Design a protein around this motif. Structure first.
Motif, PDB file in Angstrom:
ATOM      1  N   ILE A  38       0.756  -1.300   0.093  1.00 49.47           N
ATOM      2  CA  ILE A  38       0.023   0.085  -0.123  1.00 49.47           C
ATOM      3  C   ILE A  38       0.799   1.318  -0.042  1.00 49.47           C
ATOM      4  O   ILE A  38       0.624   2.037  -0.892  1.00 49.47           O
ATOM      5  N   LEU A  39       1.752   1.264   0.906  1.00 47.77           N
ATOM      6  CA  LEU A  39       2.714   2.473   1.015  1.00 47.77           C
ATOM      7  C   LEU A  39       3.733   2.506  -0.051  1.00 47.77           C
ATOM      8  O   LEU A  39       4.259   3.564  -0.245  1.00 47.77           O
ATOM      9  N   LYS A  40       4.180   1.423  -0.420  1.00 46.57           N
ATOM     10  CA  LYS A  40       5.286   1.288  -1.728  1.00 46.57           C
ATOM     11  C   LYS A  40       4.470   1.245  -3.121  1.00 46.57           C
ATOM     12  O   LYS A  40       5.140   1.774  -4.020  1.00 46.57           O
ATOM     13  N   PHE A  44       3.436   7.614  -3.364  1.00 43.75           N
ATOM     14  CA  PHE A  44       3.278   8.944  -3.944  1.00 43.75           C
ATOM     15  C   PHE A  44       1.856   9.068  -4.606  1.00 43.75           C
ATOM     16  O   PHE A  44       1.443  10.117  -4.787  1.00 43.75           O
ATOM     17  N   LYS A  45       1.303   8.020  -5.098  1.00 46.42           N
ATOM     18  CA  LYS A  45       0.087   7.925  -5.621  1.00 46.42           C
ATOM     19  C   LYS A  45      -1.031   8.471  -4.927  1.00 46.42           C
ATOM     20  O   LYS A  45      -1.622   9.517  -5.361  1.00 46.42           O
ATOM     21  N   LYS A  48      -0.079  12.381  -3.847  1.00 47.20           N
ATOM     22  CA  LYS A  48      -0.131  13.387  -4.858  1.00 47.20           C
ATOM     23  C   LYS A  48      -1.751  13.751  -5.217  1.00 47.20           C
ATOM     24  O   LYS A  48      -1.999  14.975  -5.615  1.00 47.20           O
ATOM     25  N   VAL A  49      -2.633  12.685  -5.007  1.00 50.41           N
ATOM     26  CA  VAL A  49      -3.894  13.010  -5.379  1.00 50.41           C
ATOM     27  C   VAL A  49      -4.720  13.380  -4.069  1.00 50.41           C
ATOM     28  O   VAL A  49      -5.670  14.374  -4.530  1.00 50.41           O
ATOM     29  N   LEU A  50      -4.133  12.989  -2.930  1.00 52.48           N
ATOM     30  CA  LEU A  50      -4.787  13.594  -1.920  1.00 52.48           C
ATOM     31  C   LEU A  50      -4.473  15.082  -1.533  1.00 52.48           C
ATOM     32  O   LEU A  50      -5.258  15.712  -1.145  1.00 52.48           O
ATOM     33  N   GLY A  51      -3.229  15.443  -2.144  1.00 51.71           N
ATOM     34  CA  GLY A  51      -3.021  16.797  -1.799  1.00 51.71           C
ATOM     35  C   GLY A  51      -2.833  17.479  -2.886  1.00 51.71           C
ATOM     36  O   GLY A  51      -2.035  18.586  -3.138  1.00 51.71           O
ATOM     37  N   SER A  52      -3.958  17.389  -3.794  1.00 52.54           N
ATOM     38  CA  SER A  52      -4.192  18.095  -5.064  1.00 52.54           C
ATOM     39  C   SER A  52      -4.352  19.621  -4.897  1.00 52.54           C
ATOM     40  O   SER A  52      -4.100  20.403  -5.484  1.00 52.54           O
TER      41      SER A  52
END
Length: 53
Positions: A38-40, A44-45, A48-52
């Motif tokens: 999950i973390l690997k 970043f997936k 990057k999506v959550l911090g859009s």
């Protein structure tokens, strides 16, 4: 209904996996790999999506 993910037929595997993978085995060999994949594979997936915004 709300999203797009197999849940109806999925729970069937979960309710049936109560006598194999569940008591001692969370998902498979161990959780360490669960967070790992999950973390690997989402390191970043997801961020990057959550911090859009």
């Amino acid at each position: 209904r709300r999203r797009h993910i197999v849940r109806k037929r999925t729970l069937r595997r979960l309710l049936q996996e109560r006598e194999l993978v569940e008591p001692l085995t969370p998902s498979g060999e161990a959780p360490n790999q669960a967070l790992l994949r999950i973390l690997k594979e989402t390191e970043f997936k997801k961020i990057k999506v959550l911090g859009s915004g």
